[PDB]
Amino acid sequence: GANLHLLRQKIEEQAAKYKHSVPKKCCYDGARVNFYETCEERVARVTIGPLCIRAFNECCTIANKIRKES
């Protein structure tokens, strides 16, 4: 299956680029598996704030790429 160590490491690395806790959490949340929707569909649902949205989408994108490169 997908390399979970790698996924965790890359998401940790990205989260470190955000200054504050809420965008870090948004990143982690975007990185969680979702079998039914793409990153664009998922982030379209989130309205917490623009930095949160950016983090969610970027981390979603990173995670899903690692999942598909299994």
Residue numbers in the entry: 677 to 746
Authors' own words:
Anaphylatoxin signalling through the G-protein coupled receptors (GPCRs) C3aR and C5aR leads to various cellular responses including chemotaxis, oxidative burst, the release of pro-inflammatory molecules and activation of the adaptive immune system. As for C3a, C5a activity is regulated by carboxypeptidases that cleave off the C-terminal arginine residue, producing the C5a-desArg molecule which has a distinct bioactivity pattern and generally a much lower potency than C5a, in part owing to its tenfold to 100-fold decrease in C5aR binding affinity. Here, we have reported the crystal structures of the human C5aR antagonist hC5a-A8 and of the two murine anaphylatoxins mC5a and mC5a-desArg.
Both murine proteins fold into a four-helix bundle motif as observed for hC5a. mC5a and mC5a-desArg crystals both displayed P43 symmetry with very similar unit-cell parameters and diffracted to 1.4 and 2.1 Å resolution, respectively. In both structures, the atomic model was traced between residues Asn679 and Ser746, which corresponds to the four-helix bundle core, with helix H1 extending between Asn679 and Tyr694, helix H2 formed by residues Ser697–Arg708, helix H3 encompassing residues Thr714–Val722 and helix H4 comprising residues Gly725–Ser746. The overall fold is also stabilized by three disulfide bridges in both mC5a and mC5a-desArg: Cys702–Cys728 (H2–H4), Cys703–Cys735 (H2–H4) and Cys715–Cys736 (H3–H4). The C-terminus of mC5a and mC5a-desArg (region Pro747–Arg755/Gly754) was not visible in the electron density, again suggesting its high flexibility. Surprisingly, a blob of density that assumed the shape of an arginine was visible in the mC5a structure. This density is observed in the groove between the helix H1 N-terminus and the helix H2 C-terminus of monomer A in the asymmetric unit and is located within hydrogen-bonding distance of Arg743 of the same monomer. As expected, mC5a is a full agonist of mC5aR and can activate the receptor with an EC50 of 0.57 ± 0.13 nM.
